[PDB]
Symmetry: D2
Subunit: 399 residues, 4 copies
């Protein structure tokens, strides 16, 4: 369409780069999803999916939908209209989840934080202490707010729920974190965890992956919200029958997920988490060398999947995004809603290595000069490469 | 996984064969859906999509979902809980749509027909005549029942509604018909028409395409059903903003749809419809030469996208499907629910030519012999090839 | 997408052939550095596995980035010197083209000619070997499978005559349209240079000319005074020793493609692949018999299970059948070449193709025969093929 | 997926190079019948468009299914006879290998040698032309861009000396690592045979050796007594007349790939591609200067915009830099070959690659230099390149 020379530099926090082996696995004609091959393939995907959530008790569902669809499935299967939810508004995507909760006629207790801050767990503790009659039925929290680069502590939420002996369900949006940050469903007692295929899993859009605890499944018996396409029970019915699929899945995405999981296990989930931590640290060091500000306001909330960069008031962050596309064949994340024009976002998420990031960072330095910001050329690249030269591990397959 | 020699013969009525040019168009890395390229691509898809529905007034929506999801979008955007619907139970998929309607708390007047018969429009006429107060808010009808190979006359439904001056909405499932059978949204006054990508469009699963009339859009103002992921209003909001996408689409399916539409227009929609008619006629001639019975009970309901073949009571149609897979590398459609074991289904839908079908038909003759049915070898192939030799047009690009 | 037609194109020429989906996937890749550690490691496994399809433990394979005609040229220039006497057999277009090349490289070719549709004249070979008391015949150049005629030669019979007369001539065999489809036993038959092309039964794109040389062939390179650089085996042998294998740049995509192709061949089983080709060839020949047409091959001992050359009656132009197949049925059939131009058309049945694919082609040919005015009985050829195949198609082991 | 590493592999060897996504898509296809009407129609357009990248209206192109070394061989055997005197210039590994081939084909090669890092010695050429009163020199064989050294020769200067002495020798130019990256003017320079390979600036897989011959070169085929069949131009010219173009099977996938590659070249613009390569080469040379290392190229008139050969100090092994790049950074750099083995490493910058890709590589090289104990100032080379590129990168026209 709008071709540019060389390889496009995709550094938005989703969709992310797809590894070549996964592209190959998806390069295939359709197949009959009622043939014996697809149920056999599906069975291996469900079992291996539990490993990336770090659950042995959870039941996964591979919905042909997006992350927004995964949201809807989590809410309508476990809750009823009028049920009271506590959720945390800290950015665009936590906001959009709350907008959805209200639109599905749930009573949402919204706990707001300034953009760049994490969930206000003190207000949470206060609301749980005062909930004698257990009216709060669920906590809905985004693990990683993609709009601001803020990661919340899920274990602290569990500590509060257990401290007050509160039975509320814990629903966690891990779209921007699972397979990039550490995520421990069982240890944290997460009841519904969800992610999307186009983030750290490094696949096309089209899978909304939902993992439910035994507690979450028992809650479906009481749930009076309406659902059909997103109903877990129809999937459970076909799991028992051995066919798994109540309606047609995407054959290509299933084989793609098989190849993505194989690559994840070959690198090692722990090594993937460490890789993201290196990339995020390197990016944050570059941002400080530029004299710019990370939108995250405290170190405890730093995000290793995206860095939201604040520019001074005379610089338009949207112009930085526009110039990256028009001149450097580079995709950067826009500042959304409240931070529109005030930030641009560097995604460091999924299948990406250090030299790819350094190319992006070098390009940002040229863009900032184009818009009149007085950056010392190479200062951010040098801060990142100096740190990375100490920590990049050798590629095991090549030792 | 379970590899077999040669090319797999995919003759289920969905998913269907993907043309090589479409496979190539989808062979690509992710892209930023907020970059200028994707809105530009999307605009051309929405405009060209209207041509296959044969609408100039309708508004299309490209949902990242399946046909079942398209169903849900059509119902929750135009109707409210408790609203009275008339629907026709004639097969598995019309049944599943009714199951969904009931699960979303609509009052469904179910008009049942025996499997192999079309919608009972006499009962419909009777119910419309008696609806003085216009309590019936919508008619939900499957255009082509994939489980039985039955095509209903949509124009007759419009004739009845107009005769009685009845304002009910007309929602039509065209998953199994659009781009294969003739479909005229505006002429028939269809208010919501929907199809899936994995049928005649010959794409992977993952797009539920919904097209709404101005009347359908006005009904959203009154609709009190709950929806977020399937809400048309959020799409309309982003159409006006010029970004089109309220959440992430599948980049690969959008480019795939662009290539699929280009191929459809190059062959010509009218020529595609005639091609399907040839394949269906050829299959029905072969079934009679075999001495077997078409499940469709009257000629007026014949389907040119799938032929449901009835076997005698001592033959297990599921064994025919099983042997096709294990020995001939051939996928045939199973008999579903009420016709389980009594039929098998030959799909002739999407991007498939005459020699492909003749290969399938020759294989069925060998399978029937394997299960003890006394078929005269070549009798069905000969009946089909004798008819096709008179009607196959020359390939225009090669004249 | 040029000259697009609906549905999948039916490729039934005897080369290039259909590529299995997994092989297409394997080649769907960016370039890689051929001097990086990955490519030598990959090449190592291909050379060892390629020996299996030749059925040799003695031979040394070479994966030339070239076509079948280039493999021809390397076979000749590495083992022979100008003026060397060669015995070759003209039985069709491709045995003719090899002989044309032999002459153009200034070899003294003794041409043993047969009618098109017949195999090599071994009685004439015997007398020539019997008269060659001073061993002036340096090589026998014979095509294993003549793709223009559908004729397969008995390679073991040539080795028998060579051994009977105690003649030391090298045995150079073109197996472009036979290896991995017909049985081929390099060591058992004492073949000194065997060659094939990637776009035939291997079911790959064009671009690899695969040559396998016996120790005697390698010994012959020491006395060979023909000129060669691109096709020189010694350059490959040197880089084999060095461990990097490639004296110049190979096709990265074809190396990975060949890896996937060999994996599929070993999964199905080579003996099972040979049997599958036997089924397809017999089914096709039965269809031809049912149609009332004639096989170009004149005797049963010469029938080819990779291609069938069909002779049409005098009032039909075989080229019209090929054109009609392309213009109306999205079907590719082989033309009659040179001597048999217009008198025949060719149905290729080799590589990764199954029985229902072939039956679709055969059904299409019946419709074409009707188009061009041949009084075919519709279904007669399909019924003969299906009646036979319903008895012999094995169950797919992967599906129990 | 062998020896897998995270993220995208950074391919910065000077061949094979990165393939544009649309070209990968174009080659993602099953085989087709090369005797069907589609392939000749496609080939027709490729031959006419290929002339544009050579900047010739007189020349005849040939798309051989071979590598650069095969294009070499065809250039020689079609225009020269054994014993013919050739003047060639040994300035690096690939000019050396061509000379090695010239000798092995029994030509009388007059070798004009220069130190690695220097261009062709034209003063010696002048004296040789001046002494050749009887026109015994039949051809000048010169490499346009020596990929082993990063040295570009002035082809127009050779034509000037040829015309000054009124010498009729043919001008054979290797443009494997120059055409579609550096400027190349076949007609203006009077080049008689120009050749390139697909895996270089054309940004395709290996498998096409593209040769373009002037009318004088074609006239020379009439007197050429070198032996050739696979590489013979006359076989192609005959099928050109017949309208089918191919004397043997081509690679279907590479034909469609070349179609897409040429479409991309015309869309960006050839002059814009030449300018882009100039930017990448200058940026790389600036980085090298900032690092305190030396360019192997000894004079500014010889600098190459397709590859930079970097000389390392005596306490560093250049091969260790290449190994480290592969083992830790998923980066492919070029080795120093033969004479400059261990003394240099090579950064390739040609084909479909943009500035941010190069800058990522340059940033990686700085980290490698630190690993092997070179006192590099982190960011110094990136800053020099970025400071220059921020001035010269053009806006992408497709994006207004
Ligand atoms: C944290 C988070 N949740 C939810 C979403 C919505 O996902 P999708 O666009 O796939 O609907 C996103 C964005 O992709 C996200 O970053
Ligand atoms: C007529 C009809 N409607 C609806 C559906 C359901 O579509 P999907 O499987 O994509 O959810 C099908 C089957 O695909 C169908 O044939
Ligand atoms: C038996 C035989 N030998 C040689 C050749 C020539 O091979 P290629 O076209 O790959 O150069 C062919 C044609 O494919 C052939 O069938
Ligand atoms: C200038 C030059 N000439 C010739 C060659 C040899 O070409 P090939 O490796 O494709 O045979 C090369 C290497 O690519 C080269 O760089
Ligand atoms: Cl042929
Ligand atoms: Cl090189």
């Amino acid at each position: 369409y709008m071709y540019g020379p060389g390889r496009h530099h995709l550094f938005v926090p989703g969709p992310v780069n797809i590894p070549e082996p996964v592209i190959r696995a998806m390069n295939r004609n359709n197949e009959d999803y009622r043939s014996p091959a697809i149920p056999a393939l599906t069975k291996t995907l469900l079992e291996d999916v539990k490993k990336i959530f770090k659950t042995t008790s959870g039941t996964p569902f591979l919905f042909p939908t997006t992350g927004t669809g995964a949201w809807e499935s989590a809410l309508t299967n476990t809750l009823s209209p009028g049920d009271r939810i506590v959720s945390f508004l800290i950015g665009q995507f936590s906001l959009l989840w709350i907008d959805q909760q209200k639109r599905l006629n749930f009573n949402v207790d919204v706990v707001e934080s300034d953009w760049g801050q994490g969930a206000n767990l003190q207000v949470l503790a206060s609301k749980l202490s005062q909930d004698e009659n257990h009216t709060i039925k669920a906590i809905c929290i985004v693990h990683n707010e993609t709009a601001t680069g803020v990661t919340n502590d899920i274990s602290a939420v569990r500590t509060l729920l257990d401290h007050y002996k509160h039975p509320a369900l814990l629903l966690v949006d891990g779209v921007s974190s699972i397979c990039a940050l550490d995520f421990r469903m069982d240890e944290w007692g997460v009841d519904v965890a969800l992610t999307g295929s186009q983030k750290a899993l490094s696949l096309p859009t089209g899978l909304g992956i939902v993992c439910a605890s035994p507690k979450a499944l028992e809650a479906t018996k009481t749930s009076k919200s309406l659902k059909v396409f997103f109903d877990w029970n129809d999937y459970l019915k076909f799991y028992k029958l051995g066919t798994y699929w109540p309606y047609t899945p995407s054959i290509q995405l299933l084989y793609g997920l098989r190849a993505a999981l194989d690559l994840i296990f070959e690198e090692g989930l722990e090594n993937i988490i460490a890789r993201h931590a290196r990339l995020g640290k390197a990016t944050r060091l570059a941002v400080e060398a530029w004299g710019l500000k990370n939108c995250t306001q405290k170190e405890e909330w730093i995000s290793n999947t995206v860095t939201a960069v604040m520019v001074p008031p005379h610089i338009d962050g949207s112009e930085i995004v526009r110039r990256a596309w028009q001149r450097y064949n580079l995709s950067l994340g826009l500042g959304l809603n409240k931070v529109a024009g005030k930030v641009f976002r560097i995604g460091h998420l999924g299948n990406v290595n250090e030299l790819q990031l350094l190319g992006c960072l070098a390009g940002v330095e040229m863009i900032l000069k184009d818009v009149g910001y007085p950056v010392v050329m190479g200062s951010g690249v040098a801060a990142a490469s100096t740190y990375l030269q100490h920590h990049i591990p050798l590629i095991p397959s090549r030792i």
